[PDB]
Coordinates of C-alpha atoms in Angstrom, one line a residue:
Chain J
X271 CA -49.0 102.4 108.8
X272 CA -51.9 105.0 108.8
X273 CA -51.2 105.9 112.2
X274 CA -48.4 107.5 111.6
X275 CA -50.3 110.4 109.5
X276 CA -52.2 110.3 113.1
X277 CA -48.7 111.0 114.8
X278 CA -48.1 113.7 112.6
X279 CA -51.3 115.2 114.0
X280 CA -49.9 114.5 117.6
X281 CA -47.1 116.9 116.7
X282 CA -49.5 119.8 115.0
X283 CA -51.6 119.0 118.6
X284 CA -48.2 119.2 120.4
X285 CA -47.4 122.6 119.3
X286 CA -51.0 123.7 121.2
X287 CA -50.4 121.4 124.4
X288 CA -46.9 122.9 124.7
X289 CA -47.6 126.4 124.3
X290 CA -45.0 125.9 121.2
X291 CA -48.2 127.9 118.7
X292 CA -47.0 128.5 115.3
X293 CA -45.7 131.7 114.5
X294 CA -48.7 132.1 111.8
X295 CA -50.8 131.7 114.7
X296 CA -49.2 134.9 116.8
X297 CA -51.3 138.3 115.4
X298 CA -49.2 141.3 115.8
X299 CA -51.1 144.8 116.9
X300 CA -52.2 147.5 114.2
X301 CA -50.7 150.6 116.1
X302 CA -51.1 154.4 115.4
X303 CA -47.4 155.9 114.6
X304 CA -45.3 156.8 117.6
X305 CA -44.9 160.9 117.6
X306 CA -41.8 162.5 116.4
X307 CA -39.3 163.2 118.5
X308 CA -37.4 165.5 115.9
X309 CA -40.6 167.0 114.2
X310 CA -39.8 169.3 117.4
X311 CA -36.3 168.8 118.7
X312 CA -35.3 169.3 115.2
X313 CA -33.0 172.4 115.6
X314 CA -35.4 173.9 112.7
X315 CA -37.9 173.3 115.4
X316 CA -35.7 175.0 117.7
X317 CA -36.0 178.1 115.8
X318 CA -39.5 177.3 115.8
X319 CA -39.9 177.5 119.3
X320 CA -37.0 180.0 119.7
X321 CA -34.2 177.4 120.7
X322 CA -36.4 176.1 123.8
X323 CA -36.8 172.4 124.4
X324 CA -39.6 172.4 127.3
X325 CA -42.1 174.1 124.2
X326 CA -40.9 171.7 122.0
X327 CA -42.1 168.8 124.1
X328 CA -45.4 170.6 125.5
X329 CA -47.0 169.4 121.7
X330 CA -44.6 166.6 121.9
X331 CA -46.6 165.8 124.6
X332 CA -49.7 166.0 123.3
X333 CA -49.0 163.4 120.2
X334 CA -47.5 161.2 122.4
X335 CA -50.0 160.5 124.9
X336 CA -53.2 159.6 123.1
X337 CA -50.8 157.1 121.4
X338 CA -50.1 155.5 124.8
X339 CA -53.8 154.7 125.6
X340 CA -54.7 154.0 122.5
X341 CA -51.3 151.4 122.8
X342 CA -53.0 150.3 126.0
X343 CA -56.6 149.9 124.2
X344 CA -55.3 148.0 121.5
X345 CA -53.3 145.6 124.2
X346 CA -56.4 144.9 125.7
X347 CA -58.5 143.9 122.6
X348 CA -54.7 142.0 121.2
X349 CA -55.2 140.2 124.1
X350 CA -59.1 139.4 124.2
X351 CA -58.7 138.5 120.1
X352 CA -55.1 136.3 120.8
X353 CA -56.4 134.6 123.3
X354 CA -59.8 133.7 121.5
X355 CA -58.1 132.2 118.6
X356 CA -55.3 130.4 121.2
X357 CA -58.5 128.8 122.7
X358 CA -60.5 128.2 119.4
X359 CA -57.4 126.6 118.0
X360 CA -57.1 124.3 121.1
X361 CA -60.9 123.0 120.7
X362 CA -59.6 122.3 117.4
X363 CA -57.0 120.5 117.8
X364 CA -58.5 118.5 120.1
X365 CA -61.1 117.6 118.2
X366 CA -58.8 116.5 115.4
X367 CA -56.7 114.3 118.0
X368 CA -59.7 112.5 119.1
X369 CA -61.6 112.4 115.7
X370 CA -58.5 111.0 113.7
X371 CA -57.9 108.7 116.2
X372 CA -61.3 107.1 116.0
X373 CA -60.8 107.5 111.8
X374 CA -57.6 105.5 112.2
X375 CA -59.3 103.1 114.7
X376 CA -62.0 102.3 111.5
X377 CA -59.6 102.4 108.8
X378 CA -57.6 99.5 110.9
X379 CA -60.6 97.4 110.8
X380 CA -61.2 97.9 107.3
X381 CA -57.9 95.9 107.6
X382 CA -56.9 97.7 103.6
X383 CA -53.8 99.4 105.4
X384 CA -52.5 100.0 101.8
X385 CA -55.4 101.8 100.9
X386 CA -55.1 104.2 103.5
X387 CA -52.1 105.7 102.0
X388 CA -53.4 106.5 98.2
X389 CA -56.9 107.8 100.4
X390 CA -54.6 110.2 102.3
X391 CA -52.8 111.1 99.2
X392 CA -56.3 112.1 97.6
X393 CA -56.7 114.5 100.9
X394 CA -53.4 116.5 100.2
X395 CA -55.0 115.7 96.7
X396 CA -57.1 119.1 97.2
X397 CA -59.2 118.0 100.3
X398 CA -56.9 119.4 103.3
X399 CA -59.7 121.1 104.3
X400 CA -62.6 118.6 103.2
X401 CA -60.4 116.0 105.3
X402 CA -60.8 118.6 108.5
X403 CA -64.4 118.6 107.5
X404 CA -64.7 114.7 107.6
X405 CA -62.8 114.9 111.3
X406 CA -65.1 117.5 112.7
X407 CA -68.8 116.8 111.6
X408 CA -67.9 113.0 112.4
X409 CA -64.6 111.4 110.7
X410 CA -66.2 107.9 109.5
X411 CA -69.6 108.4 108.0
X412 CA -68.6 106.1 105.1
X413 CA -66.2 103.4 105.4
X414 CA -66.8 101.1 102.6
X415 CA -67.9 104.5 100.3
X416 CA -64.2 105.9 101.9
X417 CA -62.6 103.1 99.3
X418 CA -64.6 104.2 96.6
X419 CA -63.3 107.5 97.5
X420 CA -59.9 106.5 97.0
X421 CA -61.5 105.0 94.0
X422 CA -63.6 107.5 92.7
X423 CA -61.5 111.2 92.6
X424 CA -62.9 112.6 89.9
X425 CA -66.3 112.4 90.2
X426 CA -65.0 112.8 94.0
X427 CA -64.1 116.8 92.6
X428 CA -67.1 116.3 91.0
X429 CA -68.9 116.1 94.3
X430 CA -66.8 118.1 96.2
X431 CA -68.0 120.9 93.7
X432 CA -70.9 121.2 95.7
X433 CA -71.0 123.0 99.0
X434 CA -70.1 121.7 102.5
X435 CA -74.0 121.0 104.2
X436 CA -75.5 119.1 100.8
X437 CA -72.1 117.4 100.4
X438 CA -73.1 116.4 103.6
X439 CA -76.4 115.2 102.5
X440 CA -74.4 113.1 99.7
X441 CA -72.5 111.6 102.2
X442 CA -74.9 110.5 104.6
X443 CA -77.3 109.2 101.6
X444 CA -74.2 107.1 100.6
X445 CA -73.5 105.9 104.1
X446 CA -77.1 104.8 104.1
X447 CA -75.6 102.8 100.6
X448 CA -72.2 102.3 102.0
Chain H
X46 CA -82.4 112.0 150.9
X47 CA -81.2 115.0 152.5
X48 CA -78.1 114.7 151.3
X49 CA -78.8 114.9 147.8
X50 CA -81.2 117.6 148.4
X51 CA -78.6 119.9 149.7
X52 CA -75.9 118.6 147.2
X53 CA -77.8 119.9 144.5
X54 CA -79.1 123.0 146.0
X55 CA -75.4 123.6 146.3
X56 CA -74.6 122.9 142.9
X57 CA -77.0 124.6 140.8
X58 CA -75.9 127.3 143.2
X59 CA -72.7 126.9 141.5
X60 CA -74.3 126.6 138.1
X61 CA -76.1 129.7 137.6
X62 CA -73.0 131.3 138.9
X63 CA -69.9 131.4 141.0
X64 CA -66.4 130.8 140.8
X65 CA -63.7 130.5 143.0
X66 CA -60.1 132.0 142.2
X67 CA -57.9 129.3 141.8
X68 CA -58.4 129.6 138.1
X69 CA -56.4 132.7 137.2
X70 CA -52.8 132.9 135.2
X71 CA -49.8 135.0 135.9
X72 CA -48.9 137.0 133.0
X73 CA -45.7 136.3 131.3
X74 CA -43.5 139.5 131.3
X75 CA -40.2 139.4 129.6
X76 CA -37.3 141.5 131.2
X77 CA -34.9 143.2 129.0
X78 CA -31.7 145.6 129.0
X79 CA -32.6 149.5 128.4
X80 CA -31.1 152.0 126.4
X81 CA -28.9 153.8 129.1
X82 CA -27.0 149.6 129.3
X83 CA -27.1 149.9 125.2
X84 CA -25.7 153.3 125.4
X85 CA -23.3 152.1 128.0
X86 CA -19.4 150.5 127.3
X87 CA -21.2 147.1 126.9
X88 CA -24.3 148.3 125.0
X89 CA -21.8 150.2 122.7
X90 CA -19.9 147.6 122.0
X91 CA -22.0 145.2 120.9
X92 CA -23.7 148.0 118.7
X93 CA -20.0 148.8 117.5
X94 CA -20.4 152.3 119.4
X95 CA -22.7 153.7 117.4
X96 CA -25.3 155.6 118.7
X97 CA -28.4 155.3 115.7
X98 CA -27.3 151.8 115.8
X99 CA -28.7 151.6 119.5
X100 CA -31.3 154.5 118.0
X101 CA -32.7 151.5 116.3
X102 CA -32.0 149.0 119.1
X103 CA -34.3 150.2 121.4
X104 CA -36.8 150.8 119.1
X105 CA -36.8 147.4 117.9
X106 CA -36.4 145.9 121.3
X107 CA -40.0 148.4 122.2
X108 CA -41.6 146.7 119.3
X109 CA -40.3 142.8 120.0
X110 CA -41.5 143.4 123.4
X111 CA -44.4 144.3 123.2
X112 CA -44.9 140.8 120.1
X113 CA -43.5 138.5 122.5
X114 CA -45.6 140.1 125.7
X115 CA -48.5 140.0 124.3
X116 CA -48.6 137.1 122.9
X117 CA -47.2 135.4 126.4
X118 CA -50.5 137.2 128.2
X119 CA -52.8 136.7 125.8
X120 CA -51.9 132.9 125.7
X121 CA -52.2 132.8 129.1
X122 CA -55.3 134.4 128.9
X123 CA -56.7 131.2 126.2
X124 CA -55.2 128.7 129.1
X125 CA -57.3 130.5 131.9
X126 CA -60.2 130.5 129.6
X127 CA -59.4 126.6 129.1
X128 CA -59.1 126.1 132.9
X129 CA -62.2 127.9 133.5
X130 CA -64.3 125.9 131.1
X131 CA -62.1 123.1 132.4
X132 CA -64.0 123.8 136.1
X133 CA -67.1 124.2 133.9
X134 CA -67.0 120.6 133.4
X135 CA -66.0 119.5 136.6
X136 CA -69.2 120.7 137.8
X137 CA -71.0 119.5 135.6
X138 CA -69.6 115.8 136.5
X139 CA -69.3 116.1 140.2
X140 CA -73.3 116.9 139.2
X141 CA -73.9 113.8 137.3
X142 CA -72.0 112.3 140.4
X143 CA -74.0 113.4 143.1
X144 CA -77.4 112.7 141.1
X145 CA -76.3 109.0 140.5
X146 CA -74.5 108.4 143.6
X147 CA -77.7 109.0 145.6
X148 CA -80.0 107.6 143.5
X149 CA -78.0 104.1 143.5
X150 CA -77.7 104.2 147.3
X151 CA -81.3 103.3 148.1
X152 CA -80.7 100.5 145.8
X153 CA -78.8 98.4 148.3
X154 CA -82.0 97.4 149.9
X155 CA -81.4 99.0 153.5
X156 CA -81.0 102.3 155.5
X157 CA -78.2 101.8 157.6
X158 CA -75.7 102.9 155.2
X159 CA -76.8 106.4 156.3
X160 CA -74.6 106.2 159.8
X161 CA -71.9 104.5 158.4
X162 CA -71.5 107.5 155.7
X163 CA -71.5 109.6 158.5
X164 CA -68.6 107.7 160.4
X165 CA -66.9 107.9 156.6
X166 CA -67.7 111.6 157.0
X167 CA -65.8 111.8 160.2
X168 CA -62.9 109.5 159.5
X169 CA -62.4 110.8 156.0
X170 CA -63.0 114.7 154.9
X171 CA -66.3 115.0 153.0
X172 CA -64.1 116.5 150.2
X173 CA -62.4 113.0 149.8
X174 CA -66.2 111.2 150.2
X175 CA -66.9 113.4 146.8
X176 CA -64.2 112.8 145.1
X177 CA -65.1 108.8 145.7
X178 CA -68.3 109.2 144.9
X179 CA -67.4 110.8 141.8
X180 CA -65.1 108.5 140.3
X181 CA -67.3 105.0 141.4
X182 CA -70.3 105.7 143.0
X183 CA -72.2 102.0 141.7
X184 CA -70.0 100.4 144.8
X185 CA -69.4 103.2 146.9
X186 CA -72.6 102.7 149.3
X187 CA -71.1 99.2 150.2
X188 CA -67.5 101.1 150.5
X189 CA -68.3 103.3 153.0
X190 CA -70.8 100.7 154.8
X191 CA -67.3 98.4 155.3
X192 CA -65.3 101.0 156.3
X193 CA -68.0 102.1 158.7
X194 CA -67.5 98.2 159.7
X195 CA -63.8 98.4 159.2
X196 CA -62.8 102.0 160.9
X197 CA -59.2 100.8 161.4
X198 CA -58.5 100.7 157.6
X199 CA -60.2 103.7 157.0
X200 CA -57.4 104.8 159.2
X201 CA -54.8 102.9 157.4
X202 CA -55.4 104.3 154.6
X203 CA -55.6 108.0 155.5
X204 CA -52.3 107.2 156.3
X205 CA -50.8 106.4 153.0
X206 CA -51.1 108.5 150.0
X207 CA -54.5 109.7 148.2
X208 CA -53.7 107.7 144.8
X209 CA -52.5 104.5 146.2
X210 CA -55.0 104.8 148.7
X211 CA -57.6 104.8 145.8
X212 CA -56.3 101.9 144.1
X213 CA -56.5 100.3 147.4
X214 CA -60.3 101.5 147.7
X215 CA -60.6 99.9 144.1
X216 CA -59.2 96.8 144.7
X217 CA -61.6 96.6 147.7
X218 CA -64.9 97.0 145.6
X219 CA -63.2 94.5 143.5
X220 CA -63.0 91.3 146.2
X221 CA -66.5 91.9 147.6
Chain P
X263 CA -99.9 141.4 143.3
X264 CA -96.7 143.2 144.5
X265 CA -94.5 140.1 144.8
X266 CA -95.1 139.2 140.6
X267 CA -93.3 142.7 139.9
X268 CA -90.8 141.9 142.3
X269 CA -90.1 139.1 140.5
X270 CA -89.7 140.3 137.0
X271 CA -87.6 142.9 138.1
X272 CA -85.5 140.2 139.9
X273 CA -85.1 138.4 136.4
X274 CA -84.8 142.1 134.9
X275 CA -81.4 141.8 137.2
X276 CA -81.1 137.8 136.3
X277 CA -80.6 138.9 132.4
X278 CA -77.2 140.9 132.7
X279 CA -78.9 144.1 133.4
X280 CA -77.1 145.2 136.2
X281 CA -77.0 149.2 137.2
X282 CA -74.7 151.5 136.2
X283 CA -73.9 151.6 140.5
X284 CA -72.3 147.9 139.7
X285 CA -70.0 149.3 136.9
X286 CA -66.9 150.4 139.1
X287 CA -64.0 152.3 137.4
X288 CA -60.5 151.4 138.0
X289 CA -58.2 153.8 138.8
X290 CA -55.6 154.8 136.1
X291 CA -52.4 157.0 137.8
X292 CA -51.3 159.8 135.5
X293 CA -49.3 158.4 132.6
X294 CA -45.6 159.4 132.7
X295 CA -44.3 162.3 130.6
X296 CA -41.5 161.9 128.0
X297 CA -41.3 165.4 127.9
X298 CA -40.2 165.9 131.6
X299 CA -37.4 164.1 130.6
X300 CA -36.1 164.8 127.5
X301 CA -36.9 168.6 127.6
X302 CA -34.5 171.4 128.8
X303 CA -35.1 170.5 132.8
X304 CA -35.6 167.0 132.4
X305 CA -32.2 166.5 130.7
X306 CA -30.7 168.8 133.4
X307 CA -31.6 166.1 135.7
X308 CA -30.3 163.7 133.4
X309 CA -27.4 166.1 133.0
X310 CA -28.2 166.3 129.1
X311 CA -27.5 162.7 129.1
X312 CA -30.1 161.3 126.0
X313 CA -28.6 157.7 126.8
X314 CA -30.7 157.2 130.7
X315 CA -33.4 159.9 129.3
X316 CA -34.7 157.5 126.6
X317 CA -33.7 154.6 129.3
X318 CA -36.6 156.5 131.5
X319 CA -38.8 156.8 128.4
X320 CA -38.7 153.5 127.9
X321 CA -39.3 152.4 131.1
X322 CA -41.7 154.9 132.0
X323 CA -43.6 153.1 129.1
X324 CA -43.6 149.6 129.5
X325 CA -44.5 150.1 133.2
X326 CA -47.5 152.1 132.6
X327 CA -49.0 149.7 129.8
X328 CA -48.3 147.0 132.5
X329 CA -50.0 149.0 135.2
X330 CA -52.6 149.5 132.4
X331 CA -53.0 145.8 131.7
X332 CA -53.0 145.2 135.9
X333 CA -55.8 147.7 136.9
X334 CA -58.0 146.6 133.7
X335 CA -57.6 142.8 134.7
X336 CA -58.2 144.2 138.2
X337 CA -61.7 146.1 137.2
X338 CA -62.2 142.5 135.2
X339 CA -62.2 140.5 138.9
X340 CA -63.6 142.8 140.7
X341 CA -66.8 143.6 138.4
X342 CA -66.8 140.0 138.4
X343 CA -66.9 139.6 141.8
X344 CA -69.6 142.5 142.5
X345 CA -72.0 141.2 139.5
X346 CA -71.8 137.6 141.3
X347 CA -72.2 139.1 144.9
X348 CA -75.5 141.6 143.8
X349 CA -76.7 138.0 142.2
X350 CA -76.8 136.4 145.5
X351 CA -78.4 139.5 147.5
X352 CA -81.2 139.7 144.5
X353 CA -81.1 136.0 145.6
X354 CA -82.6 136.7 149.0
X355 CA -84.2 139.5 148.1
X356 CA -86.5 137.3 146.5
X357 CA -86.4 135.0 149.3
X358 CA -87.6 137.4 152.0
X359 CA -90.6 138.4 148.8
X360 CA -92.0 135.0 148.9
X361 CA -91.5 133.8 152.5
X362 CA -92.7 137.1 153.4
X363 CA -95.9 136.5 151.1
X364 CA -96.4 133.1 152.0
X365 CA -96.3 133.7 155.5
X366 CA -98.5 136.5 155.5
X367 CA -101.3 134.5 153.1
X368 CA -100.8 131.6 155.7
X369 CA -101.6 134.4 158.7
X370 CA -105.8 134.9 158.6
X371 CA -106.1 138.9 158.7
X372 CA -108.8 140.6 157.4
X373 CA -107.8 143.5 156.1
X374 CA -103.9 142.4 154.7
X375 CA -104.5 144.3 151.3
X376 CA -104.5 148.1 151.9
X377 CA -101.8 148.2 155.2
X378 CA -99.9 146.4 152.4
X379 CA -100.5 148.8 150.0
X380 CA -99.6 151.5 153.0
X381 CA -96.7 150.1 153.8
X382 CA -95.0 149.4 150.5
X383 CA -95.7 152.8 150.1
X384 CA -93.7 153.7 153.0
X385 CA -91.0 151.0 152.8
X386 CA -89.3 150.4 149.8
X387 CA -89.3 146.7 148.5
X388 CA -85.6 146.5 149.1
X389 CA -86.3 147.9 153.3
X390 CA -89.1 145.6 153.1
X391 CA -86.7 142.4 151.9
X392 CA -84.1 143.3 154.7
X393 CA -86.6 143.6 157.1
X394 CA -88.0 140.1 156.8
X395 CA -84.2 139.8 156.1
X396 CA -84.0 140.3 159.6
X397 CA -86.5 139.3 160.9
X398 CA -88.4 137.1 159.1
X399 CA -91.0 134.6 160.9
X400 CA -93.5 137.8 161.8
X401 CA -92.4 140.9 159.5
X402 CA -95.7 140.7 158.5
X403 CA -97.0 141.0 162.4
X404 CA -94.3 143.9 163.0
X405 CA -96.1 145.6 159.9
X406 CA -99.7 145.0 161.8
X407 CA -98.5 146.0 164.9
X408 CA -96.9 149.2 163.5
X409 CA -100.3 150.1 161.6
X410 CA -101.9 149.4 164.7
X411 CA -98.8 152.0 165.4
X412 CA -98.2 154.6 162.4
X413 CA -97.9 157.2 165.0
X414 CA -94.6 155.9 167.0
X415 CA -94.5 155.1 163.1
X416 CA -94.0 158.1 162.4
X417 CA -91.8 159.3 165.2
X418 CA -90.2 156.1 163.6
X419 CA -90.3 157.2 160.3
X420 CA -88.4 160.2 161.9
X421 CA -86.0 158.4 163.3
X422 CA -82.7 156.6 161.9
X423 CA -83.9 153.6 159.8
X424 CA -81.3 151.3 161.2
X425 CA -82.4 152.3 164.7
X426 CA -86.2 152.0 163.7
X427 CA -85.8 148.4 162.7
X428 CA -84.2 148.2 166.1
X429 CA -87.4 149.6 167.2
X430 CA -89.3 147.0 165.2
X431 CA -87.2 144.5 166.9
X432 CA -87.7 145.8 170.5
X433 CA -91.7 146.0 169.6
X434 CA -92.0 142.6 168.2
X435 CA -90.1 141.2 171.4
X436 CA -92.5 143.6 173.2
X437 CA -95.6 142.7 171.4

């Protein structure tokens, strides 16, 4: 029952493993303009240049090439900063893989499988993010205060008001309850 | 003793830096048709013979290919940054195996183990004796004392394949 | 006291902050020209033809930002590979330092401290390193025998270095 939701995360982890990254994930360069051909081939620019093409494309020249190494710059920090968040997002996911595993490993011995699945509607509630939270500092710091969760949502936005590290605080005082 | 003492000089060599090259990725470069083909009877054609039509073809096909490129590189870039923390770790264990595996082997009680490592280092690569050592090293003294007793199935299996092999080498430390 | 700043200048090296010497430049070839191509004589090679001109152009392009991409990950591997290989020499640099020192504290001379002084003078600390480098179980006695010897020293001194540690060698065979 609740490991399915942990399949789902196999397939978000799948599209890491296999290379298959979501498109959102891809970051396209931020380029200077290419040079304009026609801002001197123009036949305009011909008169300019009294209808020769080699003095058209001595300044074509010129705009042109810093574009190219600056091109070649930005490659090399594209790939430096796509690569970084390829690798971050890998950590990531493993982490989640690992941490909702063990999450789903307590929630099956709280042996409450229906509960699971009002708790996880609470997460895409408003706490997608919260629920990342959970997986990453450690995904079962309150098992029986994870029912009263489910059971308490309000004041459950009334303490998720509060920031991340003193929510934190909350929910290790509450372990120490629950 | 020795051993160990060289086996960690080695690998806090290895620590505060080296690396080998077996870690690098080939760039992923996609090949494409060029203006001149999309100019051309077939280029033409599929463009409906029009030349801005290929005007924006190529210029399209510049910018897709330099997406798709860099993204290719730069993900293999991420996976050679994985690998390398990847052999980051496998130092880091063959460490913890070396410190453990000869500290435990003084445990058995008796020296003689020492030669028949030795005739396990000449029957069976060193790089093999690591790897064992790394994966069990709480039975491996004993291991390599019977196969130092037992040469012929040291032998036997060389002969058959590393895996196996090890499952064979398991089920061994399992019936002492 | 010499052998403490030879070690903080090792670790000066240890924390990243290697010479400008270690930074080598990779080699960018000229970038191809669009404009001797598409202009007046370039298109007369191309017989005016815009279609194989901008075909050029564009491959004239991708293959320099991929001969780009090469010699930077290139520089990458090979600063890399100098960086890890000046490590190691600073290594036994600092090596021949203290089995140098130690040996020479073990040895029972009288008068180690200003020859020292004379000789660092005249060596550098990186000759001196090579030379136990070399020769390491009596650098020290070379150094006595050679102050006991400034002289040839000199003519030494004079000399090719190479060949005047060969000359160290023949004298500490000779004795």
């Amino acid at each position: 029952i609740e490991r399915k939701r942990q399949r789902e995360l196999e397939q978000q982890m799948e599209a890491v493993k296999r290379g298959e990254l979501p498109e959102s994930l891809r970051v396209n360069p931020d380029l200077p303009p290419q040079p304009d051909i026609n801002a001197y081939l123009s036949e305009e620019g011909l008169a300019k240049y009294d209808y020769d093409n080699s003095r058209a494309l001595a300044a074509f020249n010129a705009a042109n090439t810093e574009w190219l190494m600056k091109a070649q710059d930005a490659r090399s920090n594209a790939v430096a900063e796509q690569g970084r968040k390829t690798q971050e997002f890998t950590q990531q996911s493993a982490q989640y893989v690992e941490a909702a595993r063990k999450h789903y490993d307590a929630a099956e011995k709280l042996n409450i499988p229906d509960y699971q699945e009002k708790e996880d509607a609470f997460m895409q509630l408003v706490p997608p993010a919260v629920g990342a939270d959970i997986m990453r500092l450690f995904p079962e710091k309150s098992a029986a205060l994870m029912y009263h969760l489910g059971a308490n949502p309000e004041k459950a936005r009334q303490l998720l008001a509060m920031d991340g590290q003193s929510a934190l605080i909350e929910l290790t005082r509450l372990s120490e309850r629950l």
